[PDB]
Design an enzyme around this catalytic site. Structure first.
Site, PDB file in Angstrom:
ATOM      1  N   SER A   1     -12.031  10.305  -4.081  1.00  0.00           N
ATOM      2  CA  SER A   1     -11.554  10.016  -2.715  1.00  0.00           C
ATOM      3  C   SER A   1     -10.024   9.936  -2.725  1.00  0.00           C
ATOM      4  CB  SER A   1     -12.145   8.707  -2.167  1.00  0.00           C
ATOM      5  OG  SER A   1     -11.717   7.605  -2.929  1.00  0.00           O
TER       6      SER A   1
ATOM      7  N   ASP B   1     -12.524   8.083  -8.201  1.00  0.00           N
ATOM      8  CA  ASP B   1     -13.800   8.567  -7.684  1.00  0.00           C
ATOM      9  C   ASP B   1     -13.682   9.898  -6.945  1.00  0.00           C
ATOM     10  OD1 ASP B   1     -12.847   7.778  -5.111  1.00  0.00           O
ATOM     11  OD2 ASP B   1     -14.546   6.536  -4.611  1.00  0.00           O
TER      12      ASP B   1
ATOM     13  N   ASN C   1      -7.884   8.642  -5.770  1.00  0.00           N
ATOM     14  CA  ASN C   1      -8.640   7.622  -6.498  1.00  0.00           C
ATOM     15  C   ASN C   1      -9.475   8.258  -7.572  1.00  0.00           C
ATOM     16  OD1 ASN C   1      -9.177   6.382  -3.225  1.00  0.00           O
ATOM     17  ND2 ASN C   1      -7.810   5.492  -4.751  1.00  0.00           N
TER      18      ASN C   1
ATOM     19  N   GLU D   1       0.820  -1.228   0.000  1.00  0.00           N
ATOM     20  CA  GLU D   1       0.000   0.000   0.000  1.00  0.00           C
ATOM     21  C   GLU D   1       0.851   1.275   0.000  1.00  0.00           C
ATOM     22  OE1 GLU D   1      -2.972   0.154  -0.692  1.00  0.00           O
ATOM     23  OE2 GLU D   1      -3.955  -1.731  -0.054  1.00  0.00           O
TER      24      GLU D   1
END
Ligand SMILES: [Cl-]
Ligand SMILES: [Cl-]
Ligand SMILES: [Cl-]
Ligand SMILES: [Cl-]
Ligand SMILES: [Cl-]
Ligand SMILES: [Cl-]
Ligand SMILES: [Cl-]
Ligand SMILES: [Cl-]
Ligand SMILES: [Cl-]
Ligand SMILES: [Cl-]
Ligand SMILES: [Cl-]
Ligand SMILES: [Cl-]
Ligand SMILES: [N+]
Ligand SMILES: [N+]
Ligand code: NA
Ligand code: NA
Ligand code: NA
Ligand code: NA
Ligand code: NA
EC number: 3.2.1.17
Length: 129
Positions: free
Chosen positions: A50, A48, A46, A35
């Site tokens: 976010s 989207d 992201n 990560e």
């Protein structure tokens, strides 16, 4: 802060993540590796709109507030910036919520794709824990 591998393992264990919800410490270290490369200051936008924050790339759609993710929740009740601290307490506490949400560590797509089913104990091998 960029943690060493055994250093992060130790911090995660200190904070009760080892075997949390049945996920061994190596699972958590593996997830953090892919990560964030063990960097607490990692952020990623992201598609989207976010953003993912910290060593476990915790997403602002559900888990933290960043003020710029429309329609989102803050179920960990924290500012997303808290997830960037050198102290991993907020990331660990929030991760415990996330992994308890129903899908286990599959919440972390990178865990599913890169850690799940692998020899995750390699990530803690050698460490004084
Ligand atoms: Cl190390
Ligand atoms: Cl490493
Ligand atoms: Cl392990
Ligand atoms: Cl937000
Ligand atoms: Cl928001
Ligand atoms: Cl912005
Ligand atoms: Cl918003
Ligand atoms: Cl909320
Ligand atoms: Cl906030
Ligand atoms: Cl810490
Ligand atoms: Cl599970
Ligand atoms: Cl991989
Ligand atoms: N452990
Ligand atoms: N998202
Ligand atoms: Na650094
Ligand atoms: Na965002
Ligand atoms: Na949010
Ligand atoms: Na941001
Ligand atoms: Na944190």
């Amino acid at each position: 802060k960029v943690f060493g591998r055994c250093e992060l393992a130790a911090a995660m264990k200190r904070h009760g993540l080892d075997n949390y919800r049945g996920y061994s410490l190596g699972n958590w270290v593996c997830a953090a590796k892919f990560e964030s490369n063990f960097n607490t200051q990692a952020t990623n936008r992201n598609t989207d709109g976010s953003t993912d924050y910290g060593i476990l790339q915790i997403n602002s759609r559900w888990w933290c507030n960043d003020g710029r993710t429309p329609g989102s929740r803050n179920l960990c009740n924290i500012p997303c910036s808290a997830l960037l601290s050198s102290d991993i307490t907020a990331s660990v506490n929030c991760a415990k919520k996330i992994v308890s949400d129903g899908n286990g560590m599959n919440a972390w797509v990178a865990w599913r794709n890169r850690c799940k089913g692998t020899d995750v104990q390699a990530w803690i091998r050698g460490c004084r824990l």
